Amino acid sequence: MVRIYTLTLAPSLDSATITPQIYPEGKLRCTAPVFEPGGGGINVARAIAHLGGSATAIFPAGGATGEHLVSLLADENVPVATVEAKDWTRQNLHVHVEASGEQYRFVMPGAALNEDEFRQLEEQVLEIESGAILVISGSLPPGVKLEKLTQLISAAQKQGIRCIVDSSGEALSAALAIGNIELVKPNQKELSALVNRELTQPDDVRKAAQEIVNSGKAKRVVVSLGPQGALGVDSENCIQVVPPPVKSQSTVGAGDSMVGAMTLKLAENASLEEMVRFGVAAGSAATLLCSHDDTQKIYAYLSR
Amino acid sequence: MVRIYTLTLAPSLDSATITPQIYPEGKLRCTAPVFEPGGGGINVARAIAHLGGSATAIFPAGGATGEHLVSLLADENVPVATVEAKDWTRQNLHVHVEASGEQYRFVMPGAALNEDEFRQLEEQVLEIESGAILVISGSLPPGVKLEKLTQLISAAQKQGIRCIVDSSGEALSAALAIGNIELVKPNQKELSALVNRELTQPDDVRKAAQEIVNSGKAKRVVVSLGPQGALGVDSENCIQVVPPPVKSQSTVGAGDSMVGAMTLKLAENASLEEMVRFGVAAGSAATLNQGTRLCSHDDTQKIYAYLS
Amino acid sequence: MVRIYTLTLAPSLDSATITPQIYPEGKLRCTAPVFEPGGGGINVARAIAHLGGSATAIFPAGGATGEHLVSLLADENVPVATVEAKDWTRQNLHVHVEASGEQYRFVMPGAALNEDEFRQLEEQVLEIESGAILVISGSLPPGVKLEKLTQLISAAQKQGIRCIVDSSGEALSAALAIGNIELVKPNQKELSALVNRELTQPDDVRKAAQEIVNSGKAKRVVVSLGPQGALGVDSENCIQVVPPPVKSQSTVGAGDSMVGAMTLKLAENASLEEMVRFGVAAGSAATLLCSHDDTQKIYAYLSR
Amino acid sequence: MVRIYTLTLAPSLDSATITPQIYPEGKLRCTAPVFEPGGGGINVARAIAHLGGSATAIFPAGGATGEHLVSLLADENVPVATVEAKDWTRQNLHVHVEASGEQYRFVMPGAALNEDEFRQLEEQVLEIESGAILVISGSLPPGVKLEKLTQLISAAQKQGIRCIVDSSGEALSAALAIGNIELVKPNQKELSALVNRELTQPDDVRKAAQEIVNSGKAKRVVVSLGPQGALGVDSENCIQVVPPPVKSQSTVGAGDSMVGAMTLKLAENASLEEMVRFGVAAGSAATLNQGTRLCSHDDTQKIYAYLS
Ligand SMILES: Nc1ncnc2c1ncn2[C@@H]1O[C@H](COP(=O)(O)OP(=O)(O)OP(=O)(O)O)[C@@H](O)[C@H]1O
Ligand SMILES: Nc1ncnc2c1ncn2[C@@H]1O[C@H](COP(=O)(O)OP(=O)(O)OP(=O)(O)O)[C@@H](O)[C@H]1O
Ligand SMILES: Nc1ncnc2c1ncn2[C@@H]1O[C@H](COP(=O)(O)OP(=O)(O)OP(=O)(O)O)[C@@H](O)[C@H]1O
Ligand SMILES: Nc1ncnc2c1ncn2[C@@H]1O[C@H](COP(=O)(O)OP(=O)(O)OP(=O)(O)O)[C@@H](O)[C@H]1O
Ligand SMILES: Nc1ncnc2c1ncn2[C@@H]1O[C@H](COP(=O)(O)OP(=O)(O)OP(=O)(O)O)[C@@H](O)[C@H]1O
Ligand SMILES: Nc1ncnc2c1ncn2[C@@H]1O[C@H](COP(=O)(O)OP(=O)(O)OP(=O)(O)O)[C@@H](O)[C@H]1O
Ligand SMILES: Nc1ncnc2c1ncn2[C@@H]1O[C@H](COP(=O)(O)OP(=O)(O)OP(=O)(O)O)[C@@H](O)[C@H]1O
Ligand SMILES: Nc1ncnc2c1ncn2[C@@H]1O[C@H](COP(=O)(O)OP(=O)(O)OP(=O)(O)O)[C@@H](O)[C@H]1O
Ligand SMILES: [Mg+2]
Ligand SMILES: [Mg+2]
Ligand SMILES: [Mg+2]
Ligand SMILES: [Mg+2]
Ligand SMILES: [Mg+2]
Ligand SMILES: [Mg+2]
Ligand SMILES: [Mg+2]
Numbered sequence A, C: 001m002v003r004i005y006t007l008t009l010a011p012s013l014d015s016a017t018i019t020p021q022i023y024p025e026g027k028l029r030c031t032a033p034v035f036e037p038g039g040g041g042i043n044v045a046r047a048i049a050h051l052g053g054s055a056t057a058i059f060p061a062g063g064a065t066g067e068h069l070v071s072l073l074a075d076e077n078v079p080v081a082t083v084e085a086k087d088w089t090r091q092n093l094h095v096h097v098e099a100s101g102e103q104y105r106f107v108m109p110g111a112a113l114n115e116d117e118f119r120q121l122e123e124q125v126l127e128i129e130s131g132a133i134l135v136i137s138g139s140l141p142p143g144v145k146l147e148k149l150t151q152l153i154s155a156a157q158k159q160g161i162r163c164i165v166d167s168s169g170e171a172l173s174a175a176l177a178i179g180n181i182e183l184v185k186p187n188q189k190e191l192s193a194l195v196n197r198e199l200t201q202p203d204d205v206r207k208a209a210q211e212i213v214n215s216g217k218a219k220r221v222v223v224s225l226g227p228q229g230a231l232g233v234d235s236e237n238c239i240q241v242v243p244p245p246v247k248s249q250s251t252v253g254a255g256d257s258m259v260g261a262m263t264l265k266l267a268e269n270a271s272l273e274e275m276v277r278f279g280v281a282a283g284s285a286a287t288l289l290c291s292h293d294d295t296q297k298i299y300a301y302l303s304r
Numbered sequence B, D: 001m002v003r004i005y006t007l008t009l010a011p012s013l014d015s016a017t018i019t020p021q022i023y024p025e026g027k028l029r030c031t032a033p034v035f036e037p038g039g040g041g042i043n044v045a046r047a048i049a050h051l052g053g054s055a056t057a058i059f060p061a062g063g064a065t066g067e068h069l070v071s072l073l074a075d076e077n078v079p080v081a082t083v084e085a086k087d088w089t090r091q092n093l094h095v096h097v098e099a100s101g102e103q104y105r106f107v108m109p110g111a112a113l114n115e116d117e118f119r120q121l122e123e124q125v126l127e128i129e130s131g132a133i134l135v136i137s138g139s140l141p142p143g144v145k146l147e148k149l150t151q152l153i154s155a156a157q158k159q160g161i162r163c164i165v166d167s168s169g170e171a172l173s174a175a176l177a178i179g180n181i182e183l184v185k186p187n188q189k190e191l192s193a194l195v196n197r198e199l200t201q202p203d204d205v206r207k208a209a210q211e212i213v214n215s216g217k218a219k220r221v222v223v224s225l226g227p228q229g230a231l232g233v234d235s236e237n238c239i240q241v242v243p244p245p246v247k248s249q250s251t252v253g254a255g256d257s258m259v260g261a262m263t264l265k266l267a268e269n270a271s272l273e274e275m276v277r278f279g280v281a282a283g284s285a286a287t288l289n290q291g292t293r294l295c296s297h298d299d300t301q302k303i304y305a306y307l308s
């Protein structure tokens, strides 16, 4: 089986905290935070670990927050390959409000990356063996030009590194610019922004996904549709997998869990069907990241 | 195409209002309300009217609010069979917050019904000819014992009135207790309450729905699943229809719209799949806009065509 | 002692309801409402009742909601003089959210008043004896031209009816246009809108209040300042009364309770000091409408 | 004018961020934060710097966040005496919601302190000369026993350091347990917790404050009352100063600003009234703007002049 790496240009050390009520103006007294590994690629690696696989998380780490992030992944036995960054690893805030049961997620940009540190990350990426899979997942941190993302992906694929992209906005277009992307998982609004139009008609998602495949931009597009599952599109196939009529109770980690599952399936040369079903199983398992047991249970139902 | 009727024991005349912000304590200055017809059966009839069908909405109407409700249904060419009620038609509040684009819905009980007023309503129902469809939809208002609703449905079925139920809690359980319900559309929470257990496993919804049809409570159970569409269950079929990948902007009127659509399909003797697909199309059509426009004929047609 | 009347051109039958949580989109299941008398002048009359006085609430009442409003005031032994209105008495919504303890107040306009019904109300007002006090309190309902408000107040004062105004926006200016208003109680933002400028400097409130007095627009201006009490201004005096360092737990009914207390004091030919102290006592009592005991306790402290 | 110092055992480097809307579940996309200095003593020193005074902020600083905190204080010409801490200076989050104009403040504990780091901090404190003022303000961080704070204040007072306290809960109670505190500024809730009873009656705040001074815990108690200003209490005087009728836009930094101002007035040997009036002026000056600008010299001067 082929090795899996992920790349998080904008990782975080997230603080999970609890407060009784949420209201403006007042000081909301929040419990001592529980630190959580943040960032697309990082969480893809974690989801892959949960699913019985192994993925090395490549990412910039700065300062004591970066160290803690590294340490958290070490304790989850997630292999890591870091680049030391000048700017300290930033912290997002996850607040659970006791009275309402609601969670609030304050998502700030990753720490800045200077040009040197990005080349250092590129260096790390280029050390990945041919045929190995790289998941580039998450936002683009300040300091990184969009063209550099494109350049990294070009450079990666020019070495037979099979690239999986999960991003948004200008970063998603940039990552997809050189084309020949193994797999891209936009959600609906990411697909909409990518293709640069509102997706209002029933077939708009499919057509946008097929366009991307057709233009050679991505070999596979999996448009994730939240509770509606995902629509996977190949040069050969177009499928929608919808999760079982269950829950959901949270959405946190849904995308990354799905991407991790699909990445494993990609690594295993699974079919589009298997890949998307497993993606939907893991994403949906996360909504109850994904546990192995929950994913397997959803996956068995989807495959029944 | 048989005659279709709806019954709304707890209608309302809803106020839709706009306010710049939402926050506690202070007076939220709300715009002069736009009145909207409220109640399950009423909106089922409205949804049917939108879809080019005709359903007569049966309901109690009380006071100027009742009068305006009837007037709103008039304007929409929705046929009506009202019984005048002593207690004024109550008002729910729909608040659109400008700053956030969010809508709040404050749902209070319908007005009380006398025993006489319910008797009149049952009467109206029992004037429905054999073979015609009655959609009983909405909450049970104060003043009505559960047994009266069960008795009403028994009497209706006794004279060949085909009954479709959309309700919750004790009213739903009461309505299904009679059995031989043509169609019930619980959403997931309602199915869970009805079957009296959490639906946590992938096949729980299906089995719960199959349980209801196997018991004879309902011939057809369409468990509506919000964005996940609906799972329709027969004695012979279990079909899930998921709406197309269009993001909803609202959920107001989704359930009633779906029921209206499936009622039409039932009346047309559509297959379960056709019925559920049209239900999903109409329900999801409703989600395309904020407000209470429900499903439009065109949006429903477009979505149904896609689902087909 | 002189008779007190109030005028509510925009009364309401308010629904007080409870719901566990507040969130958008979902149906918030609300308990069967408890009906409450709504409207400035009406609540001034109620506050006056609570304070051992009597005030007749003049207002348009339409339909079964109007009847219920009348019936609620009957049960509170508030004298009433109604005009039957074509348009049914409108309903505001007060939602208590259990989880947060917060109350939400959705305040829509009063029912429409046609021109005939307003003259009918004017007729009622003009039946008030000379020297009696009329509190015109609340919003202006649809259908009433601002000039008609001015006209009513002119007509009232032309008969020796002593007019107390509590309103906002264009209605407050209109009510104050003929001048010689006995008492006006703007809050800060009402004062700001009335005088048509932001009140940003420490002395702005006082100066705006003194301007109104000086221009002969009102004999007395009491600018209510929420937790800061009120600044009362005469042609002779300028005082600030601030409530004791207590609570508060709600603000509902604060203004009307204050106006009712000050109206009683006006009726009793109390001093500016006594009037404002009693106003602040009642307004602040309401924040714990005002009860007699709470008002007396705050008033004793203020007078100590 | 004696030397002024502040002690912040739990500082923070706060992130101020903007997001268009606030709602649960979804990712709220927040702008690149603007970093702000957090912690009671730190902001007391900042407020003093704003008012044209100088106070040296003593605090633990850990990591790049600690470094940036120190750097933020540098930029503001706020003298600093830091002890390097192993645990990185923690971050609170201030979120401005564009749609509503509302600000949310998420306050988490300060970083942990070693016994060594606290010893260094006590050391820094005990290098303060007799007669100088120390303002101990803020929460007690993890790793510090209450007794250590009490011991610190005892040692400080032992060598004639004049101690001003602004804290809550056990830390406040601990800080006052020593007694002979020059000035404490509980707000109403803090006074209530401290005196261990509800303040519901008109004279409760006054009596509670008088109780604290009469017990010798504090020479001066200024109960701050938010928009109601403050009630300052001496062995000889009870004076309430209410701010002018200017509506506040924010409450961030009100309490620290007030403390800074009163610390200055204390240092200048002002009367209780002068001190409380200047406290109120600065505290209310702070409320005029959103953000963490605290009180400006000009706004405080304007308000103080009015209150005078
Ligand atoms: N000074 C103030 N001015 C206006 N409103 C206030 C003030 N203090 C508190 N509030 C209101 O009460 C709510 C709860 O505030 P709380 O009593 O917790 O005060 P705080 O300033 O957050 O905390 P602390 O007690 O630590 O000062 C706030 O959200 C705010 O709306
Ligand atoms: N509400 C839900 N109910 C059930 N399953 C869900 C829900 N939301 C997400 N999932 C599962 O997770 C997968 C990925 O989630 P989604 O389509 O929301 O992607 P995403 O927006 O990229 O996620 P994220 O916000 O974590 O980045 C879905 O295809 C589905 O299998
Ligand atoms: N008297 C008061 N005491 C405490 N807080 C208040 C007071 N008045 C207003 N507020 C605060 O300001 C916000 C908006 O209130 P606003 O200024 O609109 O006053 P209001 O009492 O709702 O309306 P009005 O101006 O009609 O009296 C509310 O969220 C509330 O927390
Ligand atoms: N978020 C959504 N996105 C797309 N379609 C939706 C969404 N919500 C509802 N629908 C459509 O509406 C149908 C009925 O909605 P739902 O399952 O929520 O029923 P319901 O809860 O009874 O509705 P209501 O709350 O109006 O009573 C669904 O099966 C689906 O076709
Ligand atoms: N069809 C739906 N589509 C999207 N979100 C939904 C849907 N139904 C419910 N929700 C979400 O769950 C929250 C709680 O909704 P709830 O389960 O009470 O459904 P409802 O439509 O309000 O009531 P009912 O159960 O009577 O249909 C809503 O505020 C909404 O955010
Ligand atoms: N938060 C509070 N704490 C203590 N007392 C208050 C508070 N709010 C109001 N009061 C008392 O009520 C009086 C009137 O309230 P306020 O100044 O808010 O008038 P208002 O805005 O017209 O009231 P309303 O919003 O009810 O119309 C005040 O002068 C004061 O005595
Ligand atoms: N997968 C999902 N399942 C259920 N609700 C969702 C899902 N994704 C988004 N929502 C709803 O839509 C609102 C905004 O979410 P948004 O569309 O920004 O997705 P997100 O997951 O936060 O961000 P992203 O687009 O980065 O994945 C939230 O309040 C949430 O209730
Ligand atoms: N809403 C307000 N309006 C006017 N002035 C205010 C307001 N809130 C606070 N102040 C001023 O700030 C001073 C200190 O504020 P407050 O009494 O709220 O202390 P605090 O709760 O300790 O502050 P913080 O929450 O910053 O710790 C007050 O005495 C007053 O002068
Ligand atoms: Mg995603
Ligand atoms: Mg998402
Ligand atoms: Mg429903
Ligand atoms: Mg629903
Ligand atoms: Mg008022
Ligand atoms: Mg007010
Ligand atoms: Mg404080």
Ligand SMILES: [Mg+2]
Residues within 6 Å of the ligand: D187, D255
């Ligand atoms: Mg405070």
